[PDB]
Design a protein around this nucleic acid. Structure first.
Ligand SMILES: [Mn+2]
Ligand SMILES: [Mn+2]
Ligand SMILES: [Mn+2]
Ligand SMILES: [Mn+2]
Ligand SMILES: [Mn+2]
Ligand SMILES: [Mn+2]
Ligand SMILES: [Mn+2]
Ligand SMILES: [Mn+2]
Ligand SMILES: [Mn+2]
Ligand SMILES: [Mn+2]
Ligand SMILES: [Mn+2]
Lengths: 79, 98, 106, 94, 94, 107, 83, 99
DNA sequence: ATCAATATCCACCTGCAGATTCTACCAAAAGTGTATTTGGAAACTGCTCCATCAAAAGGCATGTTCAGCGGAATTCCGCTGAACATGCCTTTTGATGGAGCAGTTTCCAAATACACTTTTGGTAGAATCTGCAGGTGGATATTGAT
DNA sequence: ATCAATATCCACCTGCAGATTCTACCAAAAGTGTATTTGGAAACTGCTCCATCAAAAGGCATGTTCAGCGGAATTCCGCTGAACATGCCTTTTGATGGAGCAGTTTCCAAATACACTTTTGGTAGAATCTGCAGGTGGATATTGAT
């Protein structure tokens, strides 16, 4: 599956940038669930803005407005 | 032969990744994940390339801050190894997990 | 006919800010000074970040400010960090920081 | 076509501050997000203040209080200082 | 003097779901806060949504998307039906 | 001359909501369908909270809903809890909840 | 008269009660001073904003609405006092 | 004959009692002086509507009660049943009150 | 303490992906004088409600003794995760067309808005009506000693 | 398990603080009327988004070995809960003085909107221009064995 494309080594890299020294084996599946929940929440709102505009293309701005609503404001992609 | 002790390379990697800014999840795989999830809300969607990047930058910044909080929870328990319970405690307190 | 910005001594567009305030549905009317004050405020904050980012650029021996430098200026400054407490700067990375208990026993 | 942005003005200020320093497009894009973000927050607060006080006009007075509410201590002081300075400079220029 | 509130409407609705149940004034104050709060949150989202699409008009369509972004799953689905219903019925009349 | 509310089949005031939408500076114009739809959502939400609160009132052998009942209704409902996740109901107290490891004995 | 040291009016027993409602069973002796400092900061931030709303309206009386708006700005919305 | 509950028994009894009620737990007058003192340090000559003081008290007590729940989860995470200042600090760091 | 395998640094070099500059071009804006309309400050003032003080009384805070048991230091060891070498699958990079669908422009019918102007559904204060707070007594549930 | 010191649940009972009806004004909705105009609906263009193909190389996956972390168990000092005795200070109830807020009226500094004129800001071509990411050489530091 695609969620499994988010690899153990890549999750490690993320942890490292997070200052993490040692990782438990259950961490990788736990991290995947968290990311999926995060993407579902943000993508759901962005697509809601896409449909409202009557488009078939999810725009950077759709994503930016979605992130802002979730209180996760992002700089660098417009607006 | 030669062998670094457990933890030494781990430290090295933290220093390296805390010093750079490139994304750490391979792109193609991330893109498939995004499209797959979007498809459950609205079929036949297209994505501006910058839209997927915004999502990747947002996701990685999120996961990285979560890991720092997770690390703080593991250290609080006198450990240096993060566990599922550490991520859970951090999310509950953040208000994401009730 | 001179620019309202030059009258205010500003680089930021007092006129545009004025129009943006009207089209934003913030209120029925906008005082004449509102756009001037706002523009000055936006320029000051803009300069405050450029100054610290510029320094971050120089400390790294680079002359071009990149997102990494904006991240370093904001996160290393207590006040700017709070103002942007729930903002993510794309391609900024994080500040080097390793919890002491993780350092090897020297 | 036609995308309006704060880029040329950000670059102008970049020159008063660091005449020999440049800025990447990505960095410029981030600065533009910054100005728009702070613009929306400040204006949003001034809007609310006017409504709370049954006023129909947003004057520099609302922009000032909004600044004091949104900016951390010192940043507020200088921002309010710069705002007051710009309006005075502007109120006396025949 | 004079000050409006949703109290009589909240009250009518209370009688409909629980004919024999009353409500203290403090609880009514809370119900009033709740209605104003959700009013602002939905109107606020409708406002942004309109601006994002360079629309000068907020229609039932903006209120609708605002409700989908604001409410959790099931409350959303039901709110939408109730909303669509009232609009259709309102339109069939006159 | 019928009320816009009766035309809409609603208890909540359509006109009031219309006027509130105008005076709030949300946009230059307000379509006629907007207040109708918004008044309906509001009424649905209040009907939902009152159903549960009146129930909490009944469970505590009360006839009068008080803030404690509103709190129990909201905090015990996954969705309302989330919609009001950053809100505090004055005089609502909290839900009875004790962590397991704190309990006495064993087994 | 002069108001000083009122943070001590937040007694050890009152802080125990609050912890009880929060599900706490055992409390270390240093919790009370820590709690006082956290409450002082919480109130300084809220009162600061409420008072800013008061001065803006040009009045000398902090109203329930000033507090309610202050609380809301801080994402600490309160129902029951006019908003 | 001098009957005695074991440590923890009365505490559990206390949690059940306070989780069941909704009254404010900090004495009123003392809380009012605190508010007046802190406000006075910002601006002198301020008057307060009594409902303003109460709004601050409901807001403050809800904030502390929920902080204690989070604090408690941090102690238990550490294999303890006693809250300590370090638990309060971990909780506030994670909530972003001083991250 | 002595090598030895690697990781880390610095000075130097330079092709090009991305930045600055000339340049022109055009519409989108922004600035000024002019006429109309009004938002909101000063000035007066009726009247709510906020600060103060006095007086009684018991609900609670304070301070102390006593000892249960929680927290934390110390020791031991099973086994999970780190490091690393081997094999190789998939992500990445880049040229290519084919097309879906945003973005522009023009047309025009359904649908707002402010002023009018008539009318009643709300609101504040007075009148009218009851849920339950709080006190008492007794049957049931819980604790903790032996 | 048996028995005593106590907390706790629970239904009947009842004066009262607070809730649920009755009046009469007044902001504040709602049918019409024009005049104005948003923005949906259609024909049309071309900017990017998707599918396809293809090698180089860089990761990712797997398996082996063992260092050292996590957690179980044991121990004890001392902190913190429970219980008690003493009396302070918060709470409850009002009465008084007036500070200040909120309603009403009056009137001018200031704002919205054309209508008209000018240029600044956006874009992009195509050309111009260059900071710095990699990649090399050799020197010194870091780590870990013995
Ligand atoms: Mn019912
Ligand atoms: Mn007027
Ligand atoms: Mn123990
Ligand atoms: Mn087709
Ligand atoms: Mn009537
Ligand atoms: Mn009772
Ligand atoms: Mn009794
Ligand atoms: Mn260990
Ligand atoms: Mn005493
Ligand atoms: Mn380099
Ligand atoms: Mn070399």
């Amino acid at each position: 599956d695609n969620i499994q494309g988010i690899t153990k080594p890549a999750i490690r890299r993320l942890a490292r940038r997070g200052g993490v020294k040692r990782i438990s084996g259950l961490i990788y599946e736990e991290t995947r669930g968290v990311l999926k929940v995060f993407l579902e929440n943000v993508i759901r709102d962005a697509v809601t803005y896409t449909e409202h505009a009557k488009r078939k293309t999810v725009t950077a701005m759709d994503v930016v407005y979605a992130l802002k609503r979730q209180g996760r404001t992002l700089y660098g992609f417009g607006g | 032969p030669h062998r670094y002790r457990p933890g030494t390379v781990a430290l090295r990697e933290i220093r390296r990744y805390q010093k750079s800014t490139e994304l750490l999840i391979r792109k193609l795989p991330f893109q498939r994940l995004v499209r797959e999830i979007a498809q459950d809300f609205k079929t036949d969607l297209r994505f501006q390339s910058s839209a997927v990047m915004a999502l990747q930058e947002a996701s990685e910044a999120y996961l990285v801050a979560l890991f720092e909080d997770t690390n703080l929870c593991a250290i609080h328990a006198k450990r240096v190894t993060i566990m599922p319970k550490d991520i859970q405690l951090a999310r509950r307190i953040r208000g994401e997990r009730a | 006919a001179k620019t309202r910005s030059s009258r205010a001594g500003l680089q930021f567009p007092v006129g545009r800010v004025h129009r943006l305030l009207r089209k934003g549905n913030y209120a029925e009317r906008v005082g004449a000074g509102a756009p001037v004050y706002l523009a000055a405020v936006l320029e000051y904050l803009t300069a405050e970040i450029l100054e610290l980012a510029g320094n971050a650029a120089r400390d790294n021996k680079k002359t071009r400010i990149i997102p990494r430098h904006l991240q370093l200026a904001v996160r290393n400054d207590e006040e700017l960090n709070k103002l942007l407490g729930r903002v993510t700067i794309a391609q900024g990375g994080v500040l080097p920081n390793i919890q002491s208990v993780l350092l090897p026993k020297k | 076509t036609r995308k309006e942005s704060y880029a040329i003005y950000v670059y102008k200020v970049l020159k008063q501050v660091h005449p020999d320093t440049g800025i990447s497009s990505k960095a410029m894009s981030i600065m533009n997000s910054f100005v728009n973000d702070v613009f929306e927050r400040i204006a949003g607060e001034a809007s609310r203040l006017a409504h709370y006080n049954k006023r129909s006009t947003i004057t520099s007075r609302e922009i000032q209080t909004a600044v004091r509410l949104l900016l951390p201590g010192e940043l507020a002081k200088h921002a309010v200082s710069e705002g007051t300075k710009a309006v005075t400079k502007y109120t006396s220029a025949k």
